[PDB]
Amino acid sequence: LDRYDDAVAQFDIAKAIALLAGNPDTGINACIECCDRYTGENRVALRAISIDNTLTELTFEDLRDMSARVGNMLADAGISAGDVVAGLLPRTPELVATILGAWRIGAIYQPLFTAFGPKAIEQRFGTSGAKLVVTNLANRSKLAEVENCPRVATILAPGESLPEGDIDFRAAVAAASTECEPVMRKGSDLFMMMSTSGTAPKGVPVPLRALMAFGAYMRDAVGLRSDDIFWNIADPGWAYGLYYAVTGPLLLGVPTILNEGGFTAENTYDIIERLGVTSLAGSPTAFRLLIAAGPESAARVKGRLRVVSSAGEPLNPEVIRWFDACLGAPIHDHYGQTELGMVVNNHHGLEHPVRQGSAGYAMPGYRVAVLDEAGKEVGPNEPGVLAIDIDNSPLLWFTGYYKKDTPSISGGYYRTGDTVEFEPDGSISFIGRADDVITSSGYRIGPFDVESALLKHPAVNEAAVVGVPDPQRTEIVKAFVILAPGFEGTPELAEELALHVKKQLSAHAYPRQIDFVAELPKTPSGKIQRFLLRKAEVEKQQ
Ligand SMILES: [Cl-]
CATH class of the missing domain: 3.30.300.30 (ANL, C-terminal domain)
Known part of the structure; x- marks a missing residue:
């Protein structure tokens, strides 16, 4: 297992571009990087469990054909490269098909959380100017109230009414050709359009070069191995799900699991047992529900998980200890943001000290600092705001919100707005404002x-x-x-x-x-x- 010290001294952006199939200056396409480049062995890419708990497995080959079918469907519907296709979809292979398809023709995917009200959708369409939205019949009514709702592609069950002006998604795609030449793009070009949560909604444009950061997190922090069975619990309506449940594992060529069923603890334990999950990722909200199930419920699954990855909230120390005693697995705290991806971790893929109460270390490819009130770099144990050094962080992809301004970028820093403090060994400790x-x-x-x-x-x-x-x-x-x-x-x-x-x-x-x-x-x-x-x-x- 690589030493983290070494991984910091040996980092070089070119070595990271080498991991891509393409190149962010010559030409790149996300569907290639998360799908086409791994066809040829007919190996499984998507293990999907439907709402009635039926399993479907899909190869990279299978995904490619779906990707191409959708890409044609979108093209014929008017989508050109650099436009935005939005998805209002549950966790089903057709969600993935929509994403890889949008990426295949150089379009930008915009996730729309399946529980958004109409108002919250209209705000996000305004930010993105989406030219098309994909949904199923269940969520179709929510899109009826949206003032600026572009054309809709509706996924229909056997024999259902299609709305007046909508595209029959399943019919168009089944009747579409399987041949679709992937459009080349620059690194600076976008493939995701995210938005901030619960502070005022701003657009977060994700350029294709971000794939390097995304793949770094999957390798260095989640420590995803080719022999791992990976399940990220989170919904691809939010960044952590889209970046690291869909994009991340496929980016590496490792299969990913999608469970359409609502989250419950007993349900999670079933999946973990039924599909042999060894690498689990999710939010603290989800993991406390597992703790609320009791140590007995977790007995039948204890010993199976190799690593657990937690993001969205620093973990209570007791939650870590419960995982070690009651599941025999180490749960690690990963910190990131919608704007950045993941930046500071306790890494499952690099050897370094894991000390109680620490968030860990900057992921290689990022240089972090704690800023003074004036923006000067403070010292160890001096409290300050966690900041990304823009230069000296080759993996940084965020360059500002989409339309609005970005006051968090000044002096050559991006400020997280989270209060932390460095430990003399270099650790980050979340401290909270004094x-x-x-x-x-x-x-x-x-x-x-x-x-x-x-x-x-x-x-x-x-x-x-x-x-x-x-x-x-x-x-x-x-x-x-x-x-x-x-x-x-x-x-x-x-x-x-x-x-x-x-x-x-x-x-x-x-x-x-x-x-x-x-x-x-x-x-x-x-x-x-x-x-x-x-x-x-x-x-x-x-
Ligand atoms: Cl089954």
């Missing part, structure tokens, strides 16, 4: 002040204070304390500690809730990861 307060009934409360108050009591060896949401009060002050030996964690003690804060601090700052715990989540240096305590209180309300 300028942060709890507002409880209009009063602003510094958690540090409350913590200092608690620690002065002989029963309190360690304390961490966070704000739990409450509608009546906005937040309520909650303490997590590690008891000194000799003091029992009784409600009497809790009341005693609350009164003690009242007197030492103020009548407003005292903790209304006190949990006694054996440990607090910390970074490798000791800083308490209060945000992990806070998010667990938010999940408890859901």
Whole structure:
């Protein structure tokens, strides 16, 4: 297994372009890179489980023919290279067919989450100017309210009404030719159109050169091997699914699994057993549902997973430990963004220290820094904002949002807006902002002040204070304390500690809730990861 230190010293963008079938300056096509270049052995590329739990396996050859059929269908419908085809589709081979087909004629694929309201679709069509959208009969009504909805291709079951102006997707594609010459494109040219989530929606244009980053993550971080059976749980409506459930594995020529069925824990354990899954990837939301199933449910599948990859949320330390004890597999924290792909990981494919509370190391091909308030590079354990050094990161593909401006790009940096801090060995530790307060009934409360108050009591060896949401009060002050030996964690003690804060601090700052715990989540240096305590209180309300 490659040493990570070596992989950093030996990185060279040309070595990464060598892994492509094409070349981002001479000519490249994503369908070639994720499909045609692996035909010739009739080996399986897509293991798909339908809503009635029937298995379909499809070779790269099979995908090529679907890709070509769709490419013709789109071309005849008016799609030229550089236009946008949107997909409002569940997780079925026809979803993949639509993507590889769009890529085959140099078009741009735009994913549309199957649960988007009409309003949220119209916003995303406005960003993309999609010339065509693919959906099935079930989601066809949602597209009826969209003011700027381009032509629709409807996937129909046997003998169903096709809408007035729509294309009969299954009929056009079955009647289309299997010969479709893939259009050549430049690296700078786009094949994906993503959008941001829940902050104001901006377009994220993904150029074809991003394939290098995408393939790096699959190899260095997921550690996908040719002998792995890979299942990424996530939906291709969002970046992590589209980048690394569809594109990533195919990019490497490894089969990928798609489960049309809604996520449940027992269902996931079935798939893992039925298809021999050894490399599982997904979000913390999904993995906590597995933990909520119980150690018994996970017994029948313990020992099968080689590696688990988790993205979207730093993992609670207990979730890691549960995976090791209850599934015998190491779960690793991978951090990325819609804008970047993955950039900082605990890597399954490179040897490096995996320390509790660390996000890991910059993926080779990226140089990261922690920026001052002024944008100067701070030092180890000095807190700052995680930033990508634009130059010196050969794998970076994000050059700004599609139409709007990109204030996160200045001084030669792209700023993640996430608060972190580097460890002397080079690790990244997510730290959370030190300028942060709890507002409880209009009063602003510094958690540090409350913590200092608690620690002065002989029963309190360690304390961490966070704000739990409450509608009546906005937040309520909650303490997590590690008891000194000799003091029992009784409600009497809790009341005693609350009164003690009242007197030492103020009548407003005292903790209304006190949990006694054996440990607090910390970074490798000791800083308490209060945000992990806070998010667990938010999940408890859901
Ligand atoms: Cl079956």
